[PDB]
């Protein structure tokens, strides 16, 4: 992903 | 969070035969978190030249590692695997059994  | 105690199996890659080179395996699995210390023991002494797989994990997210080294079984030598983990109070040692 691109950031939790 | 969740911490899990490693399962430990010690075994050879191929059916053991005295005088026939082989690989001695210690498979630690189902543990969490990932830091773990695993030693292969020959007559109680730590073996050098022990390698291990790259850290991986199973479907429940618990880790597993294979530690292994070359060995040539004979009638006199005893082998074991010794494991330290945060979940373990002191090291846990499992003796190699040729029938398992």
């Amino acid at each position: 992903g691109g950031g939790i | 969070a969740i911490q899990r105690t490693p399962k430990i199996q010690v075994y050879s890659r191929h059916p053991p035969e005295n005088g026939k080179p082989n690989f001695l395996n210690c498979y630690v699995s189902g543990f969490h978190p990932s830091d773990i210390e695993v030693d292969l023991l020959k007559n109680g002494e730590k073996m050098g030249k022990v390698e291990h797989s790259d850290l991986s994990f199973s479907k429940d997210w618990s880790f597993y590692l294979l530690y292994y080294t070359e060995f040539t079984p004979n009638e006199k030598d005893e082998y074991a695997c010794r494991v330290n983990h945060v979940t373990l109070s002191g090291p846990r040692t499992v003796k190699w059994d040729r029938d398992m």
Binding site: G1, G2, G3, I4 | A1, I2, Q3, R4, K7, Q9, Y11, R13, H14, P15, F23, N25, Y27, S29, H32, P33, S34, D35, S53, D54, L55, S56, F57, W61, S62, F63, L66, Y68, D99, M100
Partner: protein, 276 residues
């Protein structure tokens, strides 16, 4: 067959002692073929199977780039998660992810995966329909809202639907001689007296690939659930697997017991017995 390409990642914070440790691995079916370990001086994504070594310099450059970008984000995520759960600055935490595609016997995307865990517990996973997310708790619900806002599900599905399968087919071709060869188990039964009137029969399955196998004992054709021990399938270290199952039996009654082994490498289910 129904093959899979899957990547797994572990990020472990080391607070007060520098950067986290990132260890990433990739698999086709049950065969590992790449790794990335942040603990080298100049870490690179590296081959771990002979049939990927032929990929050119550009492949390794891009997969190293990918790994480092992933590590950058995992670093940030470990930070974010510590805040979400209002945890102390001290103490190590673990973030894990897994993602990949299954190729269907019909040559199309059969299933997709994208899952994450924090300190060993499910955190957020892509639904099987590949359209939406499943959040374990209120912290993961915040991640879910951000990933909906960036339409991540659709973007990741496009990876699963296209390049994931493309690369999987290429791997399967380049390693067809090992990847597409079902190594059957070599099987036998050993006999170990336990007393003057009982003995252990141990049924072995050795050297098989892929890992999926069933091994059970029967007495007079009935499934045996008492007096038994089975070990979980375990790696031999050469790319194949092992498993055994043992049953304690009355001496003189060994021939009532049969071991049953099923594996992709065996055309029929195998029925075996101890053979003195």
């Amino acid at each position: 067959g129904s093959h899979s390409l899957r990547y797994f990642g572990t990020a472990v914070s080391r607070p007060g002692r520098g950067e986290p440790r990132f260890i990433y691995v990739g698999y086709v079916d049950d065969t590992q073929f790449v790794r990335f370990d942040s603990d080298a001086a100049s870490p690179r994504t590296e081959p771990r199977a002979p049939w990927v070594e032929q990929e050119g310099p550009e492949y390794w450059e891009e997969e190293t780039r990918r790994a480092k970008a992933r590590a950058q984000t995992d670093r940030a995520d470990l930070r974010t998660l510590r805040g979400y759960y209002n945890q102390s600055e001290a103490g190590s935490h673990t973030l894990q992810w897994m993602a990949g595609c299954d190729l269907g016997p019909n040559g199309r995307l059969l299933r997709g995966y994208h899952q994450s865990a924090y300190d060993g517990k499910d955190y957020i996973a892509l639904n099987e329909d590949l359209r939406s997310w499943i959040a374990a708790d209120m912290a993961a619900q915040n991640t879910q809202r951000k990933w909906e806002a960036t339409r991540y599900a659709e973007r990741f599905r496009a990876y699963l639907e296209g390049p994931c399968l493309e690369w999987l087919r290429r791997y399967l071709e380049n390693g067809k001689e090992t990847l597409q060869h079902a190594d059957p188990p070599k099987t036998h039964v050993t006999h170990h007296p336990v007393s003057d009137h009982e003995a252990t029969l141990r049924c072995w399955a050795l050297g098989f690939y892929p890992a999926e196998i069933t091994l059970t004992w029967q007495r007079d054709g009935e499934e045996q659930t008492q007096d038994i021990e089975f070990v979980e399938t375990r790696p031999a270290g050469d790319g194949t697997f092992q498993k055994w199952g043992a049953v304690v039996v009355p001496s003189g009654e060994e021939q009532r017991y049969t071991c049953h082994v099923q594996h992709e490498g065996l055309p029929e289910p195998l029925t075996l017995r101890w053979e003195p």
